[PDB]
Design a protein around this ligand. Structure first.
Ligand SMILES: NC(=O)c1ccc[n+]([C@@H]2O[C@H](COP(=O)([O-])OP(=O)(O)OC[C@H]3O[C@@H](n4cnc5c(N)ncnc54)[C@H](O)[C@@H]3O)[C@@H](O)[C@H]2O)c1
Ligand SMILES: NC(=O)c1ccc[n+]([C@@H]2O[C@H](COP(=O)([O-])OP(=O)(O)OC[C@H]3O[C@@H](n4cnc5c(N)ncnc54)[C@H](O)[C@@H]3O)[C@@H](O)[C@H]2O)c1
Ligand SMILES: NC(=O)c1ccc[n+]([C@@H]2O[C@H](COP(=O)([O-])OP(=O)(O)OC[C@H]3O[C@@H](n4cnc5c(N)ncnc54)[C@H](O)[C@@H]3O)[C@@H](O)[C@H]2O)c1
Ligand SMILES: [Cl-]
Ligand SMILES: [Cl-]
Ligand SMILES: [Cl-]
Lengths: 516, 516, 516
């Protein structure tokens, strides 16, 4: 290697005066910047449009964080032309050259770290630390994929030799594809889904989520300054069901990288399986679709340690994470002790404008608020409400940390992804039944077990069917490189991000033999 | 990694009827082409000249084996322009591509093996087996270097990482250089010295020895058919002192790869150290300059095995090898037993036209004959002639296997390289004195020890100062890859051919750092 | 390994009170030591002489930092006898034993770090940080070569196996050689050129530069305390053209390791190519001969970052570095913005006695002052003087940072190494022409490019023909292990210091086969 061994970007806690000072100034500059307009980015240049996308401050929705241009079918076609044209030469860049480009991008992102975090606080309502972890993760994706990509450099395939011939197998990129990102990790997942494919030679048209178009534009400012060739990466903020669907169904889109709801993921995967008119390849579609994550606690666990991890896992970023603990499965012996600790901890959580660095900020939008409050009403008819369950006063979309107990395993609130600060507690007899209930959902993304009994931990290691399992610690915050992230069942296609395998998904192999 | 592991090309022994049949047919085809004229090869095409070179059959010098063009200064300049023009793009070829080209050349040579061996027999007087080993070695050089070159591909240097930077070191070729080859291994060494530098990106101007211009041209027929780009390899048969010296002293020759006499090697090394008018680099000159190799035998040895190895080493190819055993150092207890056995074996050696596969063919030329006969006369005044020492009947330059005994260590025939079938026998007290006499010459190429005493063998491993040492076996016929070949002291610059280290000599290193 | 992974010795910045305190005390003790006399070091003992070498303080030349004995031909012969005698056994030391000796030497040097830096400040006029980097580099050479040498331990050569035989190839040291060092890095390069050869079994006679004999003696005090066997390393301060030339031309000197001017390097390389009377080997000569290093800046660069790097690169240690940026090539779009920033930065540079830790100390000697002022006069007739260009008031050899602009690419000041604080600015149309001008000098040591355009950086990576290339950072201060140091063309033989390959230059290979 020609760079130092990968290390995860430290997540800022803001305990020191220097950190608080830097963050206050970043928050103030971003705030003073409200209302700014960001154009589309196609073929290496910013391109404006007549229509626009508006991004509001979830902590005070009367405030416009900023606006962006709006991509329709015409802009989609333009981006496609630029991306395919760019692919023609981008695919031939030595891998070392492409990786150095990503490393430059990571360096530029790191320098604008505070600013990006501040933008997350205002645009999507993350408190300070949640914002810091998001940006740190994005930096990690770039650093990790830059190095990982070199493991696939020409000619990387291990083959069996043959007398009188040279037999060489190597990987080549797929082409131009589309990236459709979520709003909950608008810098991290947005960046990761883009730079992975791009690092190995693909070109990308990125479609940021409606609620996070501004931070997406700022990421592209970094790509532009880094110097990615025209067409290699394109920014197309717009409506998913419109320009997003258009690209997914397009005959000239080689692959689709998607992270979001199961509803949309199911549509994309189905569409990808169809041969659009004139299409000349079988589309590849990678989808990460969330889950209904549970944390199990048995009577041998450290109850205080468990309650702490459950609260962090269930309410971090208002429970708006595909990794969030939305289910708490407690064995008979641990039910009371753990539930009482969880409630005492959760009732002390603060809720307020994200800029104030509360424990919980607001949910991301009115629509999200509607969805979460709606599930709370359903919950009142399925389980026992024992904490919160209501909207708080204020313009922002504030929902109090909520807890339902005595919830039936097959209740809607114990099966459907709510994506809000709502925890469903399920009582079970023992560990065996705990695993039963844990596995009995259509998902399989994250999971956790708090227990001191080795046999239960090792049993879960083999039988708790989730892609990311954690013992005696929070089940959120998967670190790039450390914990390959991706699930099973309806949580997606198991495309592990922050793992060597991720890049192989954006490559195809060629075997060339020469008989001398 | 994309081809089978390296293996040495089997040396044909002609023990089967099919092998003999094939050789007889190759000999017929080759002699039926004795009238052919081979032009120069410059910039991808054969270019003829007014003057010419004539090659005779040393087994019947009135018979012409062929003629070639004769390169002068004008042709040297033409080749130089073509080689530098080619270097500009040849240096940028992926190493994998350059290696495949060599592998193709090896495959072609292997298919024309009998034809080349037959040409060696008629042009330089090698018997069948010596001819076969020569061609097999050339094939080995191509196969080995094609593979070794890949160990230096971009970016191959191991460096220490530094924070915030990419530090990449890699190898790059030198440019255009001249290869000046000997007549004793006109296919193997001629091929090795050319393909080694070429394999890693350099371009070469090859100047074959006057006595083997025809077989040198046939090697280029192979290079041409293999498809080396115009200018990469150039064929310039001509007078060493003329065209050879012109290139060596030229300010635009980047390196010189030479194998031949010490006399010429010393001149070349001195010239290489000077800055010619307008020259913009420090020239690298690699010179292998023969030796005065000895085989030591103590009283614990298997005398029959030793006598066999001595005869093989001293008279193989009429002793015209830089590795030939020209000194036989015997301790008191081994003297009589060994000398009598060597004499009995040597007196049974046949001598005659090489095509009849005798034990010994003729020496290569009238000049060589004059030199050898002169040393024989000198020997008569320094030691006691006990075998041979006469020219044999026929126009061919046949000289009988010769043995001198009671030769003083510092005698001219015990110090100077005769390059003929002349073995000097020196008697010593013990092994320690044997090592002292072995080391006391200006040379250090090959050497051997016949003994069963482990302490004597391991002692020699450390104190017998020669680049290639052999225990209880012949000291000639070093195999590519198995025995890196090159010596110490006045035997040259220790450029180990058939070894990974050989290619490093034709590369320079660049270190590029990028601060992100 | 039996030691921790190599890490570069930290370069002291002296920002903390502890560092300033330690340095002030070291400077005071060295100063109080002025006038001390150091003898020659031959055969493990200090040997005085009648004549002496005088070392003055360039910041106040009336002060004698110290004096040393003076080696003539008689002392050279004595050192040669001691070095060859020492080689006899030193070559047989297990590599692990030799490396541990170097590690001990490094530990002793590290403990006397402040003292050595202080000696550099007074003897050669380096400010505090330049002095710190010099000593840190020396420590790095010892630490790096100690480990690197183990990679060559018996039996290190990868060979192809053969049926019924043991085939073992291994490296052995060359013998006793001479090291001729420069005055600009009298601890670093002096140490590196000595310990590299010595680590693998060679013995050395070291000839320090006239202006840095005292610090050279202090290095030998460390070697002595470390315990290198008598004769392994010898200290011979004296006149280069006298005792230096004597050793270079001597028939019993096996190799020459030289760093200095191109004029002397050319003479040494030529002499090394000659066979002195009675010489029994082909001499090896490694020469690093400086350069005419340029930094290129295009219109896409961070002009502030570039101006800062240019000033550090051009004036660090008064531009008395073979790596110093003596040329600034600016494209049309970057000319004005960068030149104005360079001038504003350079005009603020302080000049004064090195002990005061100014930005620039004095040039090293009266002769150097004469040479630099002379080139300034030539510059006034070739380009436009826009800053400095004069001597400052004081006894010390102080020259103001100088800048010439509108300099013709082929002007003497844009082609010849001035080795002073003189920068030549060259205006060009674009990057293509920038590379043209950059490569058009007889040298090829260091180079740099400030640019944000990936295509220009990657183009330079392959076409800016210098051994050490840096992007968006200073082109001086190559770190051992991180950036193999050595150039192309007339900058030397490309012997990369602080790289694994460096040690191979002081070894020759032996292949020993045993047929069972
Ligand atoms: O409903 P939601 O807003 O919760 O969806 P969602 O949260 O699953 O949407 C995630 C991302 O996909 C996009 N998207 C939404 N519907 C899409 C569709 N039909 N085709 C392609 N992309 C689509 C969104 O704009 C956003 O970028
Ligand atoms: O005696 P031998 O027959 O062993 O071979 P040799 O050492 O005389 O010559 C070996 C090779 O070098 C060439 N050569 C001879 N003299 C030369 C010179 N002065 N400069 C450059 N090349 C020269 C020859 O033509 C031949 O190719
Ligand atoms: O002139 P300069 O003083 O600038 O040279 P220089 O700076 O190139 O000298 C560098 C080193 O080489 C030595 N040296 C100088 N001339 C030499 C010669 N002819 N042979 C061998 N070593 C020599 C010097 O004493 C010093 O140790
Ligand atoms: Cl599982
Ligand atoms: Cl030896
Ligand atoms: Cl280069």
């Amino acid at each position: 290697m020609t760079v130092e061994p990968f290390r995860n970007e430290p997540i800022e806690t803001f305990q020191t005066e220097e950190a608080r000072r830097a963050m206050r100034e970043a928050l103030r500059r971003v705030r003073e910047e409200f209302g700014r307009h960001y154009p589309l980015y196609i073929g290496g240049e910013w391109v404006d449009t007549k229509e626009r996308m508006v991004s509001l401050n979830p902590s005070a929705p009367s405030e416009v964080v900023g606006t962006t241009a709006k991509a329709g079918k015409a802009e989609a076609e333009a981006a496609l032309e630029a991306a395919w044209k760019a692919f023609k030469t981008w695919k031939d860049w030595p891998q070392e050259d492409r990786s150095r480009l990503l490393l430059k991008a990571a360096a530029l992102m790191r320098r604008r770290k505070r600013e990006l975090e501040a933008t997350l606080v205002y645009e999507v309502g993350k408190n300070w630390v949640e914002a810091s972890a998001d940006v740190a993760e994005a930096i990690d994706f770039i650093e990790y994929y830059a190095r990982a990509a070199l493991r696939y450099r020409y000619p990387a395939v291990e083959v069996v030799p043959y007398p009188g011939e040279d037999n060489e197998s190597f990987y080549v990129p797929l082409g131009a594809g589309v990236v459709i990102a979520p709003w909950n990790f608008p810098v991290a997942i947005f960046t990761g889904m883009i730079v992975g494919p791009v690092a190995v030679g693909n070109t990308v048209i990125a479609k940021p989520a409606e609620d996070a178009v501004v931070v997406g534009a700022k990421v592209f400012e970094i790509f532009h300054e880094a110097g990615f060739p025209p067409g290699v990466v394109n920014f197309l903020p717009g409506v998913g069901e419109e320009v997003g669907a258009y690209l997914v169904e397009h005959p000239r889109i080689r692959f689709i990288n998607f992270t979001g709801s199961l509803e949309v993921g199911l549509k994309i995967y189905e569409a990808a399986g169809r041969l659009a008119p004139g299409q000349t390849w079988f589309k590849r579609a990678y989808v990460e679709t969330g889950g209904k994550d549970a944390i199990i606690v048995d009577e041998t666990a450290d109850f205080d340690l468990a309650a702490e991890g459950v609260v962090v896992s269930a309410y971090g970023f208002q429970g708006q994470k595909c990794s969030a603990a939305s289910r708490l499965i407690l064995t008979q012996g641990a039910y009371e002790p753990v539930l009482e600790r969880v409630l005492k901890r959760a009732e002390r959580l603060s809720v307020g404008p994200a800029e104030e660095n509360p424990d919980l900020g607001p949910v991301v939008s009115a629509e999200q608020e509607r969805k979460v409050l709606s599930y709370i009403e359903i919950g009142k008819n399925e389980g026992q409400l024992v904490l919160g369950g209501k909207r708080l006063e204020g313009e922002g979309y504030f929902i109090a940390p909520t807890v339902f107990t005595e919830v039936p395993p097959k209740a809607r609130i114990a099966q459907e992804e709510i994506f809000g600060p709502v925890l469903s507690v399920i009582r079970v007899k023992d560990f065996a039944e705990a695993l039963e209930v844990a596995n009995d959902t259509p998902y399989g993304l994250t999971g956790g077990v708090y227990s001191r009994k080795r046999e239960h931990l090792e049993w879960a290691r083999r039988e708790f069917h989730v892609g990311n399992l954690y013992f005696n610690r929070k089940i959120t915050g998967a670190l790039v490189g450390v914990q390959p992230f991706g699930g099973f069942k309806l949580s997606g296609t198991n495309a592990k991000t922050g793992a060597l395998d991720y890049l192989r998904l954006f490559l195809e192999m060629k075997a060339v033999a020469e008989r001398f």
